[PDB]
Design a protein around this ligand. Structure first.
Ligand SMILES: OC[C@H]1O[C@H](O[C@H]2[C@H](O)[C@@H](O)[C@@H](O)O[C@@H]2CO)[C@H](O)[C@@H](O)[C@@H]1O
Length: 476
């Protein structure tokens, strides 16, 4: 709707403060500003913006914006040099996609270790110490650590500590072909997490609100969270510190660093109003103050403000953790990475898959966009799903699936491609066209399980071949 600004931002952010900024905007321009916090908005935005609908402005960490830009959902930003100089350059670099500025950077985000000083004056420096510490607190009616296990954002710092990575950065770009989900380091880290759960130091079902409640009411000595979380702790009775994440196998935990960013919907008729709102209301000492006061932003992108923020030790700790991590890629393939790791962590933590199997499925999903939906019952068939998210640059051109009975080609277009995979011995005769698992194979680790597998050959646009396999496991 023209003559009005609609803003979407995550419900864990400073939306009331931004609303107050919006009030400051309406009052001067007569233009009403409505701030909303849709659920799973990072998914809902590309859905509705694609229909020409949605907000004028969308706020999210920069990693999602490359996908948005590739789908044509974001207007190009062209700020003056003067405005550009007001913000730190690396924050601008975070919002650049295939050459163009696709958003306004706002603040730099990283997870930190947050601890209750009255329970735990000297918090552990290593993950390895948490079990012994938990045993001591449990006797006192408390627990050592609770944090959100449902979102891979929070568990990634540990998985990445021993060598896990999303995409390798080489020769001036992310190498979409070199995916780090499945390696020895990632396995060691996720195994440590799963072991914390097996040993009842953490609970697989723990989510954001459970961990927030447990920490802010004094039940658990530590939590892992970002700056947005500090204001609720300020309200609580907890005297807290914000410090460096614990090390794992002697290496720093490596949080993925986000830059909170504001994109303008390409379909918005209101773009000039959105630009002026963002530049002359939101990014100002006053506006950033308003939002930061409602819920802290971390290290803001605005130079004038940063100088006052660097004095807040919580922000300093934030930047200390950021320096030990890595800025998130913004490439479209990140959406497949995050989906794949979310599934792996949830499945490993619950005990539905082993760490090795979970990561192996995650690796293939993040790298090749292939998901295999297994059935516990052999008589019900598996489904292989191909769902490409990257349409530009180095991409898989050709895909061949190796099934027990031969090779079959599978195309990559924008859309979704699904085939059934049959377990062998299931059909009384050979079914024309059907892809059949190789197996059953033994699994040395677990004696009660049978493995089935198919293989895949990938031909990249540059001629590079690569190979994947996908497994399903079944109880005998
Ligand atoms: O969990 C995967 C998720 O991680 C990041 O989302 C963060 C976000 O950056 C923070 O600002 C805060 O809101 O917490 C989110 C996790 O709940 C990625 O930005 C996102 O794309 C990804 O799906």
């Amino acid at each position: 709707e023209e003559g009005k600004l609609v803003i979407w931002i995550n419900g864990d952010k400073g939306y009331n403060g931004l609303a107050e900024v919006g009030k400051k905007f309406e009052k001067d321009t007569g233009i009403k500003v409505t701030v909303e916090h849709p659920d799973k908005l990072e998914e809902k935005f590309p859905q509705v913006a694609a229909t020409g609908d949605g907000p004028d402005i969308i706020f999210w960490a920069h990693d999602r914006f490359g996908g948005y830009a590739q789908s044509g959902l974001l207007a190009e930003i062209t700020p003056a040099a003067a405005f550009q100089d007001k913000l730190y350059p690396f924050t601008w670099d975070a919002v650049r996609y295939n050459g163009k500025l696709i958003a306004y950077p706002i603040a730099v985000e990283a997870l930190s270790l947050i601890y209750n000083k009255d329970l735990l004056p000297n918090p552990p420096k290593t993950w390895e110490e948490i079990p012994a510490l938990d045993k001591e607190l449990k006797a006192k009616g408390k627990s050592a650590l609770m944090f959100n296990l449902q979102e891979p954002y929070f568990t990634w710092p540990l998985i990445a500590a021993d060598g896990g990575y999303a995409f390798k950065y080489a020769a001036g770009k992310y190498d979409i072909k070199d995916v780090g989900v499945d390696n020895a380091g990632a396995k060691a880290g996720l195994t440590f997490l799963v072991d914390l759960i097996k040993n009842k130091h953490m609970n697989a079902d723990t989510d954001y609100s459970i961990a927030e409640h447990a920490f802010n009411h004094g039940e658990t000595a530590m939590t892992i969270n970002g700056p947005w979380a500090w204001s609720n702790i300020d309200t609580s009775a907890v005297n807290y510190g914000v410090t460096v994440l614990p090390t794992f196998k002697g290496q720093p935990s490596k949080p993925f660093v986000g830059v909170l960013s504001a994109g303008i919907n390409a379909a918005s008729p209101n773009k000039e109003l959105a630009k002026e709102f963002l530049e002359n209301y939101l990014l100002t000492d006053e506006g950033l103050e308003a939002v930061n006061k409602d819920k802290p932003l971390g290290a803001v992108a605005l130079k004038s403000y940063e100088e006052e923020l660097v004095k807040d030790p919580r922000v300093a700790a934030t930047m200390e953790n950021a320096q030990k991590g890595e800025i998130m890629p913004n490439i479209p393939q990140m959406s497949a990475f995050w989906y794949a790791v979310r599934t792996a962590v949830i499945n490993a933590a619950s005990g539905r898959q082993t760490v090795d199997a979970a990561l192996a499925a995650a690796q293939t999903n993040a790298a090749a966009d292939l998901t295999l939906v297994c059935s516990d019952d052999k008589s019900k068939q598996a489904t292989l799903i191909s769902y490409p998210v990257t349409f530009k640059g180095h991409v898989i051109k050709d895909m061949q699936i190796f099934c027990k009975n031969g090779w079959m080609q599978m195309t990559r277009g924008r859309g979704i491609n699904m085939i059934r995979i049959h377990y062998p011995q299931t059909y009384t005769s050979v079914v024309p066209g059907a892809c059949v698992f190789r197996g059953p194979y033994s699994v040395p680790t677990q004696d009660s399980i049978e493995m089935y597998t198919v293989s895949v050959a990938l031909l990249w646009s540059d001629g590079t071949p690569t190979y994947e396999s996908l497994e399903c496991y079944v109880t005998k």
